[PDB]
Every structure is written in C-alpha cells, then in structure tokens.
C-alpha cells in the first residue's frame, strides 16, 4: 500500500482536505489507506469512505453511460460504423469502474463487515456492498449477471433485516438503505412493483415516527423521505 507509511489520523485529515479540494480520487486513496490500518471506522470516517468512492464511481458511471449511448447509436443502420474505438474506450472505462467496485467490495470483505457488530456500522457496510454489486450489475452482460444481481439483493436484504430489528424507521441509514434497495428493484431487478411497495411502506412508516425526532434529526430523515417521494412520482 502506497499509504502504509502514513499515520491513520493523517490519512483521515487528508481525506477531509481532498474533499474540500474536490479531489475525490485522492480522497478515496486516503480512505482506503485508513481502512487498511485495520481499525474499525467511526461514523464520520464511514461517511468519508462512502463520499469518496461514490464520487469516483459516479464519474465512471456517468462516463460509461455517455460512451454506451454513443456505442449503441453507432451499432445501428443510419449514420456509420466507425471501427472499434467506441467499444474499446467504453470497455476501458467499464474495466476501470469494475476495478473500483472490486476495491470497495474488497475493503468490505477484508474486513469491515466481519468486524462491524453495531447495527449502524453493519447496516452501513451491507448497504455499501449492495450498492457496489448494483454498480457492477449496471454494466454486466455475461455469465455472471444473474449472480451479481443476487449478490446485491442478498447484501441489501441482510441489511434490511438488521435495520428493521435494530433501528427506528426514521434512522437515516435505514432510510437510505431502503431508498437504494428500491432503486435496485426498479432499475436492476425489473421489479417495479416491489420498488414501489418498498418505497411507499418505507415513507409511511417513517412519517409515523417523525414525531419522536429533534429538529435536526427531522431534517435528516425528511431529506431522504423526499427522495423516496421523488422516485414514487417518477415510477407512478
């Protein structure tokens, strides 16, 4: 590891600096280094890890979608087929994306998840596991597409089971998990009715628990609830 010589606290500090500077690849590298120190992550540190990798993979996903669209348009009878370059470059970006997902999944497997015993930590990491299998699913076409989809489903389901037992329905981790699992159902699993049902039940059960929250917690929960509502509006 290129970060093995740097102090854990220095890596975390530099991740925060990288975030300010909008240097998300650096941020991710610093947070990978921090994880590889072998200690459990705090809430704030888990968020740093997530922000970093979400930004990196988000850029890759956006690029892949642009290239895939150009490729699909190129592979038709209308304009012109301009040789192997679009496919080659889409494949390059795809492979880089898959690599990032593999890196995150690797951190989760070695050994964030197995050491995570509190509900907040375990659900957070299982949600992440679902998310990065979902990103793999977005680009999968081969023999393993089904298995990738099932891996995402299984991670999300384990997270859901823990979240329903251990967290209130307004907990932002529980809400974000349900949001993402609902996106999985709609966009990946071809199960829009499951997506809609999950989003609606999640929204309604959260609504009923808002009365228990402080002003600040209310803001946190309702912001995610809005996203559930936005998807329901799109889907229905």
């Amino acid at each position: 590891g290129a970060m093995g010589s740097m102090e854990r606290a220095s890596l975390i500090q530099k991740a925060k600096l990288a975030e300010q500077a909008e240097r998300y690849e650096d941020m991710a590298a610093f947070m990978k280094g921090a994880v590889e120190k072998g200690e459990e992550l705090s809430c704030e540190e888990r968020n740093l890890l997530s922000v970093a990798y979400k930004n990196v993979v988000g850029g890759q996903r956006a690029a892949w979608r642009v290239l895939s669209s150009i490729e699909q348009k190129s592979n038709e009878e209308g304009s012109e087929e301009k040789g192997p370059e679009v496919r080659e470059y889409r494949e390059k970006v795809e492979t880089e994306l898959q690599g990032v997902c593999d890196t995150v999944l690797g951190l989760l497997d070695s050994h964030l998840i197995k050491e995570a015993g509190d509900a907040e930590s375990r659900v957070f990491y299982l949600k992440m596991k679902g998310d990065y299998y979902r990103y793999l699913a977005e680009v999968a076409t081969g023999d393993d597409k089904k298995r990738i989809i099932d891996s995402a489903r299984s991670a999300y389901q384990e997270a859901m089971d823990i979240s329903k037992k251990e967290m209130p329905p307004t907990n932002p981790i529980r809400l974000g998990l349900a949001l993402n699992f609902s996106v999985f159902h709609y966009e990946i699993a071809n199960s829009p009715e499951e997506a809609i049902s999950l989003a609606k039940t999640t929204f309604d059960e959260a609504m009923a628990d808002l009365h228990t929250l402080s002003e600040d917690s209310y803001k946190d929960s309702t912001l995610i609830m809005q996203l559930l509502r936005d998807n329901l509006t799109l889907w229905t």
Binding site: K54, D131, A195
Partner: peptide, 9 residues
C-alpha cells in the same frame, strides 16, 4: 429519467 439513490450531500 433514472431513479434517485442516496446522495453524498
């Protein structure tokens, strides 16, 4: 239009 997942901020 694509569904919205949990954002960073």
């Amino acid at each position: 239009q694509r569904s919205t997942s949990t954002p960073n901020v």
